[PDB]
């Protein structure tokens, strides 16, 4: 309702449309039989309208106008309009891939970027400023359960906070997405929200300016200068994963915080694709906004003077590198870094710029490298606190147990050293930030925010992707297991006896293949400890150990125009081809240990600290960090946020179906649907079930007040031709397999469809004024008489007007005893009761109206009429037989008044017809026992218990010689 949305002010249209909008959208034309989804080559899925069918093929017209034919089993139902832009997609009737996709797309196209799907909060990058993050919207989300407000990431944050205070247990919020999907912005939103609402925070010996909240928030511009970069998909992309824990003490007050980082993209430091930059800090320093830095670093202000940082782009329209240097330098001040610490970091950064400018050439006629120039090597060693001759001597002639390098190797070696200094500098800075955020105030609970690259499949997938995907496999298993426990709780609460093996188990084989002994990483680790091992011997040890034995391990699918791969892995998100060139190298990450010896002895304390503790391979460390991350996550109640990148052109409002589909298959959303689908995903309250699927068998669910809805559903379902094992009865709901409710929904559309046909046929049979002929042949107490009637009928107004003439003299019985006997098909059924118009539905074949009228005093009429169309005219042909009538009685002795009273005709059903019962007052009592039955061996509408309200007006035509009756009757159903 609209008033509930008032509290959101200007944000409201971006969170939920008004009931006026929503009313319209849910009245749009829809045919469950024609409006479908079909697969599509270029778009994955598209809507389509079915045009024709034959031989188990379907022909349809795509929403793009393309004619297509497809196998019947490839056609999927659309959800009806009541479900348009639904806020939680777990409520959809049809919950297949295109239904999810098109709900997202519909919501996003109306500027609603947030959507729930079960546990998931789904966020679509808007590419546009939205007014939904104001203080007013913060206030309106405080303390609300998820269901009490529109979808929003504030809901996730506020609830995670309240769960911690209320349950006194750790919480985590897991945020994934592809690069550019908006993980980093969402992560900041969530942490800013904690800083706004968290209770402080009793005061007590720690570096930093401001409050802990200021410091937590300032860790961002600090880390982003060294860990973020202009990529093709995002001007400000994090190239590292991040887990931040915000700690609270025993009474719920903000206590401290710590950050862990993962998987910094080292390669970016010395290499860029054409449309990308290196990390921000290089261009920030180069902005000359703090000129003493250019002097301290022995550099110009031209990035193109530096090979490591100028292979792609060097300026970004959206980024003022000058302003950002101040933000970076300010952040290091707030976090309590000394000027020595700060400057030492700037120096190492300048040193790395120079490193990549050092040139080398070949000796006169040898294959040995020697320095070409020496200037840039000099500037570099100086900043690093090292001897320049020692540096260049280390590079060219390393010591083992000792020498030998060509130009290729030297160029390779300096590049690896640049990357290693930079990575270890990054870790150092994070540990220093952690030292500021450490307040030594007691901690009892935390809220962990994890922000890491999601599962991604590239054209070329190498060792780094394997690490990403392994992590995400472990994170998806974690979700599955959590989803399993909640499902069990739900089936238990409802008393449904169901179970299955833990959903997290489905991912165990993939995980074991990667992580157990003799698994892929174990082999890689074993192999790079062998000096003579090669990429080819590695390939072999994997195949020899797993091809044929581990089903998730497979031959590469070497597809189309995609680069060479060596094996393929079956992950939850799909099958991935891995290229294993260079993995022995990447895993052991060899460094020139002569030059590392110099770093260790540097006079610059920082550089010396960075290599102090210098065996461990990349994969062993990753395993260690992941295990530490998962132990933390498993101690929490988790919440999951999915970021979606809608398109590749930063365009607001528009979605590429395939891009979004890939993401949905990879990020857990479709996974979540699949595993709940193992059980009984569709759940319906007994009340809603009756008020929706009654029409399938109206007999088994009576009408009225106090109705036993569980019995109604148990009787109705038991009476259909369906797999009775595909539903179970809980305390308050019916649980359905997805296929079965989808069938009930098709059957309902079919039954509803037949009805609309039959009622339409039966109204265009009574459109216009309709001619009536009435014929009676009476026989009361042995005295025959005959009445004839002629008049006009008009069902639209529920009016009829007839003249009746006794064509055999004076009438043996009073005229008001023949009204009930003298065409209820002219009743006006309201525009909403029409399916209950039995009389019209029996036409033109007509119906038999048999009656038995017992009069109080006298005897009784036995009536049998046939009411059928007969040309363009409606004929009511009655035969009557009054018997055992008192000759002195108020009937036969013409005692009754010349008037009629209003009655209700109480209609029930039978089978193929109806039956009524009513008592007429004249004042003489008379009870009617009416039965109607069709005459055509064809379908008629049996109605729910209802009554006809009838009014009858007896008059005389003053000009009529013969004994007669003029009648006016007004009849309407209710
Ligand atoms: C991202 O995907 C996932 O994580 N999942 C989303 C969908 N899943 C399937 C599922 C499981 C449990 C209950 C429901 N449905 C619901 O509660 N009521 C309901 C109401 C009316 C009708 C026709 N069907 C059901 C349900 F869809 C739940 C997790």
Residue numbers in the entry: 2 to 205, 209 to 405, 412 to 624, 644 to 851, 855 to 943, 946 to 956, 963 to 1014
Show sentences the authors wrote.
Here we present the structure of the human β-cardiac motor domain (cMD) fused to GFP determined without drug (Apo structure) and with OM bound (OM+ structure). The lever arm α-helix projecting from the myosin MD is truncated within the IQ motif that forms the essential light-chain-binding site and joined to a short amino terminal α-helix of GFP. This corresponds to residues 1–787 of the human β-cardiac myosin fused to residues 5–238 of Aequorea victoria GFP. The protein was crystallized without nucleotide and is in the extended, near-rigour conformation.
The structure of the cardiac MD::GFP chimera (cMD) was determined to a resolution of 3.2 Å for the Apo and 2.25 Å for the OM+ crystals. The drug, OM, is tightly nestled in a narrow cleft separating the lower 50-K domain from the N-terminal 25-K domain. OM binding involves extensive interaction with at least six residues from the 25-K domain (A91, M92, L96, S118, G119 and F121), two from the relay helix (M493 and E497), four from the SH1 helix (V698, G701, I702 and C705) and four from the β-sheets of the converter domain (P710, N711, R712 and L770). There are four potential hydrogen-bonding interactions between the protein and drug that involve A91, M92, S118 and N711. However, analysis of the protein–drug interface indicates that OM binding results in extensive solvent shielding of residues that couple the structural elements that are central to the conformation changes of the recovery stroke: the SH1 helix, the relay helix and the converter domain. For example, OM buries the only solvent-accessible surface of the E497-R712 salt bridge that links the relay helix to the converter domain, thereby fortifying the bond. Comparison of the Apo and OM+ structures reveals changes in the β-sheet that propagates out from the drug-binding cleft and results in a twist of the final three strands (β5, β6 and β7) of the sheet affecting the β-bulge and the HO-β5 loop, key elements of the Transducer region.
